[PDB]
RNA sequence: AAAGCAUCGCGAAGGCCCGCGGCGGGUGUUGACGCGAUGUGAUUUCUGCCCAGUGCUCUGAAUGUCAAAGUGAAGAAAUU
RNA sequence: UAGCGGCCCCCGGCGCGCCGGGCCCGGGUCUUCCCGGAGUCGGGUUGCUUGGGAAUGCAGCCCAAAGCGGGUGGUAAACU
RNA sequence: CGCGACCUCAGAUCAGACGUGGCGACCCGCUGAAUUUAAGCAUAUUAGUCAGCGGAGGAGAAGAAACUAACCAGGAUUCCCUCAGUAACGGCGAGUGAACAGGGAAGAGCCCAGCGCCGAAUCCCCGCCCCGCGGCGGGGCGCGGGACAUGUGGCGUACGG
């Protein structure tokens, strides 16, 4: 419904994938800043959304996905028609949302069949 | 053998209809809101001869409902109509000669002409000169109407089928003996290349199943099966009977 | 065709199921393997119904 | 029309054969062209052997030719594994590799494994950089010995083991060769129907 | 991944899910023109296993071909020969309808190269195929060494010379006792070799 | 050939015909006073008997024949 | 004409010679994980084709897979 | 109402490219006779040939086994000799007719999809500067555009990884 989906996007906005320009900023900054001290700081890659049906399908099978959101207007529907059942079998919560274009805006793309939360 | 005359006609070519001087397609007005729920008035501007057709045609002018423009319609002329007469078409039109009404609203025994075979086909039945159809009965539950066609056949049609009240003008045309081969020549010169007709028994075997012989004779039964292939289907096709028809027509 | 085969197997018409599946899938060896695994799912359904 | 005694012949000349007749007037020219290409290739690849990479010994199939050996397409992966040669490296140093071949018996495998090792000793390996050698043949070995080996590399020859004359024992004189073949054929022919009958009586008795 | 499931689902063509999808799709494809460019592959799994990649220069065309055999196009069914050659109906074309579909797509788009094609639906009168086409002059195609082969002139109109997967299936190619007709590369090549009289110089 | 005469098919999902093909095309800008297919040959006066044969046509309750598919039975299955 | 004859001009690969530069780990053993192309195969039937003969290949239509599976093993079939 | 996103479509003398037609000896994909032989003739033969249509290249096609075999086994394709006028086909008539092994010519192997893992790590276009520099590009930059999670690239393909 409308208020849940709005709430869902509000949380998913906080874990949007870095844009290529944003990643380049992160890099130059990380490379130059870590050059002054010790370069070897892998630290922790922050949590982020995982997009794409192939990426999500593997995450569900490994039970690494805390929450799976699937667009309702995927065409061909074969790309996701198995996904609700698969999420049920592995016991990961899944929600169908209105608009693949809405999901695509999260990942800065035109569309997206599904997204998944792994860590928050 | 070679291709017989009846088979060449389907290729068109010299057998196509002579339509150079024909005045148009004699059809009813296209069905619309006005003629579905009320009536529309039109005026007969002219009654014209259509070459190859024994029935006169009427140029009828109606106002257009949606645009400031006059619409000219070519009708089959019901006998008795005259220039300057108003004719009305619609469900709520009155039962007068030349008016166009759905057959459902007509009382039983109405004589009609230029009758739609299907609702909205703009007139297919009883269009030749002197012919008419009769409304026999109605079935208000099924929205169906039974009519009697000029052939004597009785047909069930939808009650939304429109028709022109009256008979087609020009009746009695076949009463006059043509008398001369020349008058027959001029008659078909306006229709199509189908005249004169050579008897098959006067041809040669190469070009007609009946050709040949040291005597002119069919030699085989003239009655031929319905499934006979083209080029063989000559004579009396699928004849149920042959000989002078004595007594009345059956079935 | 897998549904009708299972109907025949449920009435214990094993011969009729094999002759049906053979016509549908083609060879006799393909027919046995199919009929056999359809028997397992019917057996699986019986276990679930019992529990 | 036949005439007196003759052979019944069916010559296959009822099609337009004259349209497809291959003459061999370019045969001398073809032989020259192949020779020049061989010479050109040998000069290009010198000092590597002119014929090509070394091939393994394989036994010809069928009963007609199983007594003879010949050159195979390439050494099997098992032969290279035993010889200690990486399959990717083998091609660069002049060893043909055939991943399709499988070794059914150990005699064939050891024959080709020995062939590979003996080839490796005979191989002179030039360094990739002439100034700097790492694990390549010795400068002296490269300087003089290296020459283009013409003809197949280590030709595959049919070896026959001589068997010296010996005294015939009593057992050999008593061996019935004909009857051994005749019974062996019948044993193979009747083995099944004997297994059926012997089995059939088993549940009959039990 | 996802593709394995889509591949397994597409194998269940008489399931309720796939029966519905095929029927609603086949109706939709019947409402378009015989040749029509698809915005994207209908079957992403089947497309990419046949050579398709989601990059610029790869295009999909949906082709509709009438089903059935090949009636002999002689006037009035007269063949003017011996009774062995009197057949007009019950005759079959040597190539498949999938091959014909590739030929249609290739002929219309002469500037592209037919890579492969795959089935997407059928009804009583039409079969629907999606042909993968490659533009041989796009930089994303010419600057990729894996796809540089399609840009060579010898690969012009592969579908018209029986070089695509669907086209080569009708040639009788293959290895073994079954495919002896086409030893040498083609049935014509084998026939030429076996009917050529080799007259040597010394006979 | 012809007018005249007679017979036959057809109410359009149709008759007759074309066409390799698109339910494409001709008749048809048509609709039984029409289109299509035959015979005879103006007018006058007549056009008898025969449905056994061969055609054509109607009918299909039902028996006798009657293909592929399907259904059954036996068999390990092919098959019968 | 003959000639590992001469001279001139142009063009190309190789051979060693700084760079403009890019690019840069491999093998063995052990443990664990992973592993495959579907209206396709196959079956029926039809037509063509083949030396392929109870069907060599191809195609149409109908049926329509499996995963210790599938194909082949030149006589149809079942079991091994 | 409207404003946006996507999807599916459309128009342009839009920016930049590409196809057409020819030749056709040889090559590839189709279509495809009859004369003729059978002392007649219909299956057969002629012949998958002529004619007809399409598509190429300097060669083409084929090609790295869903192979052959049944041996102590061979090992992509193509060509030659042989197998062999043979096994087989055939109004079992006329006629037709391969392959495997063997010896040679040549010799060369490989890549994806999938399955996974790597922060899409990938690609196209545009603008600018520096250098080789008839546009072939290399790099650097740009909070430039687009493709792309309906999946680009690295690794990896049955010889396992
Ligand atoms: K006659
Ligand atoms: K008609
Ligand atoms: K009679
Ligand atoms: K009678
Ligand atoms: K078939
Ligand atoms: Mg004729
Ligand atoms: Mg005339
Ligand atoms: Mg007359
Ligand atoms: Mg006449
Ligand atoms: Mg005459
Ligand atoms: Mg005749
Ligand atoms: Mg007479
Ligand atoms: Mg007469
Ligand atoms: Mg008589
Ligand atoms: Mg050689
Ligand atoms: Mg695109
Ligand atoms: Mg002919
Ligand atoms: Mg053919
Ligand atoms: Mg090539
Ligand atoms: Mg190729
Ligand atoms: Mg072959
Ligand atoms: Mg020959
Ligand atoms: Mg008279
Ligand atoms: Mg008469
Ligand atoms: Mg009489
Ligand atoms: Mg009497
Ligand atoms: Mg000189
Ligand atoms: Mg097996
Ligand atoms: Mg066996
Ligand atoms: Mg422009
Ligand atoms: Mg051209
Ligand atoms: Mg020349
Ligand atoms: Mg003769
Ligand atoms: Mg003669
Ligand atoms: Mg003759
Ligand atoms: Mg032929
Ligand atoms: Mg020709
Ligand atoms: Mg050229
Ligand atoms: Mg070549
Ligand atoms: Mg392989
Ligand atoms: Mg071979
Ligand atoms: Mg001999
Ligand atoms: Mg045969
Ligand atoms: Mg032949
Ligand atoms: Mg051989
Ligand atoms: Mg990938």
Matching residue, tokens 């027919």: C31
The reply to whether residue A77 touches residue E21, judged by beta carbons under 8 angstroms, is yes
Q: What angle do CA B182, B183, B185 make, to 5 degrees?
A: 60
One DSSP character per residue, E60-100 reads EEEEEEE-S------GGG---S-GGG---SS---SS-HHHH
Longest dimension (CA), chain B: 73
Q: What is the CA radius of gyration of chain A?
A: 17
Q: Which residues pair with B112 in a beta bridge?
A: B133, B165
Phi-psi label, residue B13: left if phi above 0, alpha if psi -120 to 50, beta otherwise = left
Give how far Cα E54 sits from Cα of E51, E134, E146, E148, Å.
10, 11, 15, 17
Matching residue, tokens 């080839």: D119
Distance CA(D204)–CA(D65), nearest Å, equals: 48
Distance CA(E170)–CA(E174), nearest Å, equals: 11
CA B234 / ligand 24 centre spacing (Å)? 13
3-state secondary structure of E64: strand
* Helical axes C2-10 vs C14-25, angle rounded to 10°: 170
* Helical axes E2-11 vs E16-30, angle rounded to 10°: 80
Q: Among A112, A106, A109, which Cα is nearest to A48's?
A: A106
Residues of chain E that touch chain A, judged by Cβ-Cβ distance less than 8 Å: 1-3, 5-6, 9-10, 17, 21, 42-44
Q: Report the protein residue whose CA lies nearest the C1' of nucleotide F77.
A: C28
The reply to whether residue A53 touches residue E9, judged by beta carbons under 8 angstroms, is no
With the CA atoms of C17, C22, C27 and C31 taken in that order, what torsion angle do they form, in degrees rounded to the nearest 10? -30
Give how far Cα B61 sits from Cα of B29, B35, B85, B166, Å.
10, 15, 11, 20
Q: Among B104, B103, B9, B84, which Cα is nearest to B41's?
A: B84
Interface check A82 vs E, CB under 8 A: yes
The residues, ordered by sequence, that sit 6+ positions from A32 with a Cβ below 8 Å of its Cβ are: none
Distance CA(D161)–CA(A41), nearest Å, equals: 72
The method of structure determination was: cryo-EM
The residues, ordered by sequence, that sit 6+ positions from B18 with a Cβ below 8 Å of its Cβ are: B51, B52, B189, B190, B191, B192, B193
D154: its two tokens: 């280590």
The reply to whether residue A76 touches residue E9, judged by beta carbons under 8 angstroms, is no
One DSSP character per residue, D124-160 reads ----SSSSS-SSPPPHHIIIII-----SSSS------
Cβ–Cβ under 8 Å, residues B99 and B89 = yes
D73: its two tokens: 């397409």
Distance CA(C6)–CA(E71), nearest Å, equals: 42
Cβ–Cβ under 8 Å, residues B28 and B126 = no
Distance of CA A84 to the CA centre of its chain: 17
Distance CA(D57)–CA(D110), nearest Å, equals: 10
Phi-psi label, residue B126: left if phi above 0, alpha if psi -120 to 50, beta otherwise = left
Distance CA(E6)–CA(E46), nearest Å, equals: 9
Distance CA(D116)–CA(D86), nearest Å, equals: 12
Length of chain B: 251
The residues, ordered by sequence, that sit 6+ positions from E154 with a Cβ below 8 Å of its Cβ are: none
- Which DSSP symbol is given to D20? S
Length of chain C: 51
One DSSP character per residue, chain B reads ----HHHHGGG-GGGS---SS------PPPP-HHHHHSEEEEEEEEEE--TT-SS-EEEEEEE-SSSS-EEEEEEE-BTT--TT-EEEEETT--S-TT-EEETTTSPTT-EEESB-SSTTS---BS-STT--EEEEEEETTTTEEEEE-TTS-EEEEETT-EEEESPBSSTTGGGS---SHHHHHHHHHTT-S--S---GGGS-TTT-TT--TTTT---S-SEE-TTPPTTT--SEET-S--S---S----
Distance CA(E17)–CA(E9), nearest Å, equals: 9
Cβ–Cβ under 8 Å, residues E165 and E101 = no
Buried b (16+ CB within 10 A) or exposed e, C1-11: eeeebbebbee
Cα dihedral across residues D182, D185, D186, D187: positive or negative: positive
Q: How many beta carbons lie within 10 A of that of residue E141, not counting itself? A: 21
Provide, as residue numbers in chain A, all residues whose Cβ is less than 8 Å from the Cβ of E26: none
> Is E18 exposed, middle or buried (CB count within 10 Å of its CB: 0-12, 13-18, 19+)?
middle
Cβ–Cβ under 8 Å, residues B210 and B218 = yes
Cβ–Cβ under 8 Å, residues B26 and B57 = yes
Helix ranges (DSSP H) in chain A: 2-12, 20-36, 53-61, 78-81, 83-89, 100-106
The dihedrals phi and psi of B156, each to the nearest 5 degrees, come to: -95, 120
E117: its two tokens: 């094609």
Q: Among E109, E126, E106, E120, which Cα is nearest to E33's?
A: E126
Q: Among E126, E166, E100, which Cα is nearest to E29's?
A: E126
Cβ–Cβ under 8 Å, residues B177 and B114 = no
CA D68 / ligand 23 centre spacing (Å)? 108
On the CB side of B57, how many CA atoms lie within 13 Å of its CA? 19
Which helix (H) or strand (E) element contains residue D116? helix D106-122
Cβ–Cβ under 8 Å, residues E10 and E22 = no
Longest dimension (CA), chain C: 37
The residues, ordered by sequence, that sit 6+ positions from B151 with a Cβ below 8 Å of its Cβ are: none
Distance CA(A55)–CA(A48), nearest Å, equals: 13
Length of chain D: 206
On the CB side of B193, how many CA atoms lie within 13 Å of its CA? 10
Q: What's the distance, Cα to Cα, between the start and end of chain E in Å?
A: 67
Give how far Cα E101 sits from Cα of A34, D116, E61, E131, E133, Å.
59, 53, 10, 8, 12
Distance CA(B22)–CA(B51), nearest Å, equals: 6
Q: What's the distance, Cα to Cα, between the start and end of chain A in Å?
A: 23
In chain A, helix, strand, coil percent, each to 5?
50, 10, 40
E95: its two tokens: 């190539």
Q: What is the CA radius of gyration of chain C?
A: 11
Q: Among B125, B105, B97, B96, which Cα is nearest to B28's?
A: B125
Question: B13-17: long-range contacts (C-beta < 8 A, 24 or more apart)?
Answer: B14/B193, B15/B192, B15/B193, B15/B194, B16/B192, B17/B52, B17/B191, B17/B192
Distance CA(E106)–CA(E132), nearest Å, equals: 10
Distance of CA B150 to the CA centre of its chain: 10
Buried b (16+ CB within 10 A) or exposed e, B72-104: ebbbbbbbebeeeeebbbbbebeebbbbbbbbb
Best residue in A51, A62, A76 to probe E by mutation, most E CBs within 10 Å?
A76
Resolution of the experimental structure, in angstroms: 2.6
Subunit partners of chain A (3 or more CB pairs within 8 A)? E
Distance of CA B17 to the CA centre of its chain: 15
D136: its two tokens: 């390549």
D29: its two tokens: 């020219």
The reply to whether residue E21 touches residue A54, judged by beta carbons under 8 angstroms, is no
In angstroms, the CA of A79 and the C1' of H15 are apart by 36
Cβ–Cβ under 8 Å, residues B68 and B74 = no
> Is E118 exposed, middle or buried (CB count within 10 Å of its CB: 0-12, 13-18, 19+)?
buried
The dihedrals phi and psi of B132, each to the nearest 5 degrees, come to: -160, 165
Give how far Cα A50 sits from Cα of A83, A104, B217, E145, Å.
15, 12, 94, 31
Q: Among C14, C47, C48, which Cα is nearest to C38's?
A: C14
Distance CA(B46)–CA(B164), nearest Å, equals: 17
In chain D, helix, strand, coil percent, each to 5?
45, 5, 45
Q: Which nucleotides of strand H come closer than 7 angstroms to any CB of the protein?
A: 5-9, 17-20, 27-35, 42-49, 54-81, 85, 94-117, 119-125, 142-143, 145-153, 159-160
The reply to whether residue E5 touches residue A86, judged by beta carbons under 8 angstroms, is yes
The dihedrals phi and psi of D180, each to the nearest 5 degrees, come to: -60, -45
Tell me the residue ranges of DSSP E strands in chain D. Answer: 21-23, 57-59, 69-71
Cβ–Cβ under 8 Å, residues D107 and D66 = no
Give yes or no for a cis peptide into A76 (omega within 30° of 0): yes
- Which DSSP symbol is given to D169? P
B108: its two tokens: 């039983």
Cβ–Cβ under 8 Å, residues E96 and E166 = yes
Which residues 36-75 of chain E have a CB under 7 Å from nucleic chain G? 46, 49-50, 67-69
> Is D94 exposed, middle or buried (CB count within 10 Å of its CB: 0-12, 13-18, 19+)?
middle
With the CA atoms of B52, B57, B63 and B66 taken in that order, what torsion angle do they form, in degrees rounded to the nearest 10? -40
3-state secondary structure of E35: strand
Cα dihedral across residues D46, D49, D51, D56: positive or negative: negative
């Amino acid at each position: 419904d409308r208020q849940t989906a709005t709430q869902l996007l509000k949380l998913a906005h906080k874990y949007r994938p870095e844009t290529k320009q944003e990643k380049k900023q992160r890099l130059l900054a990380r490379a130059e800043k870590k050059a002054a001290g010790k370069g070897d700081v892998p630290t922790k890659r922050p949590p982020v959304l995982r997009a794409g049906v192939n990426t999500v399908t593997t995450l569900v099978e490994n039970k690494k996905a805390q929450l799976v959101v699937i667009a309702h207007d995927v065409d061909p529907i074969e790309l996701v028609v198995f996904l609700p059942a698969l999420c049920r079998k592995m016991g990961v919560p899944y929600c169908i949302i209105k608009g693949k274009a809405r999901l695509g805006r999260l990942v800065h793309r035109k569309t997206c069949t599904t997204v998944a939360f792994t860590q928050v | 053998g070679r291709v017989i005359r009846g088979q060449r006609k389907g290729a068109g070519s010299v057998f196509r209809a002579h339509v150079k001087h024909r005045k148009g397609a004699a059809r009813l007005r296209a069905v619309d809101f006005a003629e579905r729920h009320g009536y529309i008035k039109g005026i007969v501007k002219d009654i014209i001869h259509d070459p190859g057709r024994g029935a006169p045609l009427a140029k009828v002018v109606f106002r257009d409902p949606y645009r400031f423009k006059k619409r000219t319609e070519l009708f089959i002329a019901a006998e008795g109509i005259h220039t300057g007469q108003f004719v009305y078409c619609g469900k709520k039109a009155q039962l007068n000669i030349g008016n166009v009404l759905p057959v459902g609203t007509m009382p039983e025994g109405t004589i009609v002409c230029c009758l739609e075979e299907k609702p909205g086909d703009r007139g297919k039945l009883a269009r030749a000169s002197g012919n008419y159809a009769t409304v026999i009965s109605h079935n208000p539950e099924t929205k169906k109407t039974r009519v009697k066609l000029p052939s004597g056949s009785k047909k069930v049609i939808s009650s939304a089928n429109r028709a022109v009240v009256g008979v087609v003008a020009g009746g009695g045309r076949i009463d006059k003996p043509i008398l001369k081969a020349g008058r027959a020549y001029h008659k078909y010169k306006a229709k199509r290349n189908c005249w004169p007709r050579v008897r098959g028994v006067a041809m040669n075997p190469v070009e007609h199943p009946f050709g040949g012989g040291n005597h002119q004779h069919i030699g085989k039964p003239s009655t031929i099966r319905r499934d006979a292939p083209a080029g063989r289907k000559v004579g009396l096709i699928a004849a149920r009977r042959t000989g002078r028809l004595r007594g009345t027509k059956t079935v | 065709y897998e549904r009708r085969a299972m109907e025949l197997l449920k009435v214990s018409k094993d011969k009729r199921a094999l002759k049906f599946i053979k016509k549908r899938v083609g060879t006799h060896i393909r027919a046995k393997r199919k009929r056999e695994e359809l028997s397992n799912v019917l057996a699986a359904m019986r276990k679930a119904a019992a529990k | 029309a036949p005439s007196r005694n003759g052979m019944v012949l069916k010559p296959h000349f009822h099609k337009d054969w004259q349209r497809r007749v291959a003459t061999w007037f370019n045969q001398p020219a073809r032989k020259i062209r192949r020779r020049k290409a061989r010479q050109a290739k040998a000069r290009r690849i010198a000092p590597r052997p002119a014929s090509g990479p070394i091939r393994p010994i394989v036994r010809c199939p069928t009963v007609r030719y199983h007594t003879k050996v010949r050159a195979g397409r390439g050494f099997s992966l098992e032969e290279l594994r035993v010889a200690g040669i990486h399959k990717k490296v083998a091609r660069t140093i002049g060893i043909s590799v055939d991943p399709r071949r499988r070794n059914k018996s150990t005699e064939s495998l050891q024959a080709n494994v020995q062939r590979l090792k003996e080839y490796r000793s005979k191989l002179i390996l030039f360094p990739r950089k002439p100034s700097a050698p790492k694990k390549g043949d010795s400068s002296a070995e490269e300087l003089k010995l290296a020459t283009q080996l013409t003809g197949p590399v280590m030709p595959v020859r049919n070896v026959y083991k001589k068997e010296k004359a010996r005294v015939i024992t009593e057992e050999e004189k008593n061996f019935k060769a004909f009857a051994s073949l005749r019974m062996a054929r019948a044993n193979a022919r009747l083995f099944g129907i004997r297994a059926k009958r012997a089995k059939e009586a088993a549940e009959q008795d039990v | 991944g996802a593709y394995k499931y889509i591949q397994e689902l597409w194998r269940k063509k008489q399931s309720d899910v796939m029966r519905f999808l095929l029927r609603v799709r086949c109706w939709q494809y019947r409402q378009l023109s015989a040749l029509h460019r698809a915005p994207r592959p209908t079957r992403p799994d089947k497309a990419r296993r046949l050579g398709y990649k989601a990059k610029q220069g790869y295009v999909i065309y949906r082709i509709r071909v009438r089903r059935g055999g090949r009636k002999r196009p002689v006037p009035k069914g007269a063949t003017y020969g011996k009774p062995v050659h009197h057949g007009v109906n019950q005759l079959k074309f040597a190539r498949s309808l999938q091959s014909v579909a590739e030929e249609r797509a290739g002929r219309h788009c002469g500037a592209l190269r037919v890579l492969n094609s795959y089935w997407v639906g059928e009804d009583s009168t039409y079969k629907f195929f999606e042909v993968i086409l490659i533009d041989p002059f796009h930089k994303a195609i010419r600057r990729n060494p894996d796809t540089q082969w399609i840009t060579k002139p010898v690969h012009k109109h592969r579908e018209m010379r029986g070089l695509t997967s669907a086209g080569r299936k009708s040639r009788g190619l293959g290895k073994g006792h079954k495919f002896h007709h086409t030893i040498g590369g083609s049935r014509r090549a084998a026939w030429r070799r076996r009917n050529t009289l080799q007259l040597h110089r010394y006979r």
